[PDB]
C-alpha cells in the first residue's frame, strides 16, 4: 500500500578507511575522512593480534565516520558518480542496505592540501522508513513491523526508479 | 595398628537414655540480642509508666 509514512530515506552514511598502522599513515587518513565529512572522525582499535597483517591488540588501525543529513546525500551521490551510478546487485544486504568503495581523489576536494595520499574508502549506506525509532528508543523498544522494513528488493527499486 | 576409626554406632542409643531434652518453655522470653534502638525505647516507656 502507498501510505506516505512509508517513504524510504537514508538514516546514515558511514565511511570506513582501514589501514593497519598508526602514527602518521592513519593520522592522515583521519584528515581526508574529516575533510570529507565535516566532523571529527573516530579511530577503531584492533583485536586478535593477527601477525600476518602485523597488528597488535588494542592498537588503532582504522578510521570511520557516520554522516547523516544533507551532507550525506551530497556526499553519497558524489561517490555514486564515481561508480557511474551502478552497483553489482550483490552489493545489497539481505536486510536493508548497501555499500561500495572508491579510490579517494576522484571526489571533489583538492589532493595535497596536507600532501595526503590516495586513501581508498568504504561507503556503506543504510536505508530506513519512518518509525525505525521504535527499535532504537530507550523506553518501549520493539521490532519494527515487517511492513515498515526495507527489503533488498525495495532498496533495488529505490536505487533505480529514482535518486538518479 | 590402623588407628583411625569413626562410627555413629550406639550414639542414638546414648542420646535417648536421658531423652532428647527440650528447653523449658518460658513466659517472658529473653530480649538479649534484639534491636538496641527498640530495647532502649521499651526501657524508657516502662520508666515513665504511671
Amino acid at each position: 500500500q502507498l501510505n506516505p509514512m512509508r517513504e524510504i530515506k537514508v538514516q546514515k552514511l558511514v565511511l570506513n578507511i582501514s589501514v593497519g598502522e598508526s602514527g602518521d599513515r592513519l593520522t592522515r587518513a583521519a584528515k581526508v575522512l574529516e575533510q570529507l565529512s565535516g566532523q571529527s572522525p573516530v579511530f577503531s582499535k584492533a583485536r586478535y593480534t593477527v601477525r600476518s597483517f602485523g597488528i597488535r591488540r588494542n592498537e588503532k588501525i582504522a578510521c570511520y565516520v557516520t554522516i547523516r543529513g544533507e551532507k550525506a546525500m551530497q556526499l553519497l551521490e558524489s561517490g555514486l558518480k564515481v561508480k557511474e551510478y551502478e552497483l553489482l546487485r550483490r552489493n545489497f544486504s539481505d536486510t536493508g542496505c548497501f555499500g561500495f568503495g572508491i579510490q579517494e581523489h576522484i571526489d571533489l576536494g583538492m589532493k595535497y592540501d596536507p600532501s595526503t595520499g590516495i586513501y581508498g574508502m568504504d561507503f556503506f549506506v543504510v536505508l530506513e522508513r519512518a518509525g525505525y525509532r521504535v527499535s532504537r528508543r530507550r523506553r518501549c523498544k520493539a521490532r519494527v513491523g515487517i511492513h515498515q522494513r526495507v527489503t533488498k528488493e525495495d532498496a533495488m527499486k529505490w536505487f533505480q526508479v529514482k535518486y538518479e | 595398628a590402623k588407628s583411625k576409626n569413626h562410627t555413629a554406632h550406639n550414639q542414638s542409643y546414648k542420646a535417648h537414655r536421658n531423652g532428647i531434652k527440650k528447653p523449658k518453655r518460658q513466659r517472658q522470653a529473653s530480649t538479649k540480642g534484639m534491636d538496641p534502638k527498640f530495647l532502649r525505647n521499651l526501657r524508657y516507656s516502662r520508666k515513665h509508666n504511671v
Binding site: - | 546414648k14 542420646a15 535417648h16 537414655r17 536421658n18 531423652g19 532428647i20 531434652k21 527440650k22 528447653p23 522470653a29 540480642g33 534484639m34 534491636d35
Partner: protein, 156 residues
C-alpha cells in the same frame, strides 16, 4: 572449617528452580513480619547476604527479632541429647510466611463462636476434632456387577 566449608554440599540445595531465576518478585519484600509469627526458611541462591547456613533451609521457626532488611528466626537444632534453640538473622529474601497454623486460627475463631453460640442455648458442647472412625451400616442398590478373574499368563 575442619573439612567442609560454609556452602559445602549445597550444589542442589542452593540452586534456583528451573525457569525461575533472575528477577525476585515484589511480594517477598511487601510481606511484613512480627515478633511471634512463624516463618519457613528457604534460601535464595541470588542473595548472597543474610544467607542462613544450609541446616536451616527447609525448617520452620518463630520470629523473635526484626531489624531493617532482616528477620530474626528461631530454629531448634538437635545436638547430642538436647535441643538447642538457635537464633539467626536472615534477610527477607530467604524466608516465607508459613501456613503451619493457618488451620488453627480458622478453627480457633470457629471454636469461640460455637462455644458462645451454644451457650445462648443449653451451654454444653465439645469443639474437639475427631480422627476418622468406622462407617455405619447402609444399603446398596442392586445394580450392574462386573466379575473380574485372574488373567492367563501371556509370554509377551
Amino acid at each position: 572449617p575442619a573439612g567442609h566449608g560454609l556452602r559445602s554440599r549445597t550444589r542442589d540445595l542452593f540452586a534456583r528452580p528451573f525457569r525461575k531465576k533472575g528477577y525476585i518478585p515484589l511480594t517477598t519484600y511487601l510481606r511484613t513480619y512480627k515478633v511471634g509469627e512463624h516463618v519457613d526458611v528457604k534460601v535464595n541462591g541470588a542473595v548472597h547476604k543474610g544467607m542462613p547456613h544450609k541446616f536451616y533451609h527447609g525448617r520452620t521457626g518463630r520470629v523473635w527479632n526484626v531489624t531493617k532488611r532482616a528477620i530474626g528466626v528461631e530454629i531448634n537444632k538437635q545436638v547430642g541429647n538436647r535441643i538447642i534453640k538457635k537464633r539467626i538473622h536472615v534477610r527477607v529474601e530467604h524466608v516465607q510466611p508459613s501456613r503451619c497454623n493457618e488451620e488453627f486460627l480458622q478453627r480457633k475463631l470457629n471454636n469461640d463462636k460455637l462455644k458462645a453460640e451454644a451457650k445462648v442455648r443449653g451451654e454444653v458442647i465439645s469443639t474437639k476434632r475427631q480422627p476418622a472412625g468406622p462407617k455405619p451400616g447402609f444399603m446398596v442398590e442392586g445394580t450392574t456387577i462386573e466379575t473380574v478373574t485372574p488373567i492367563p499368563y501371556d509370554v509377551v
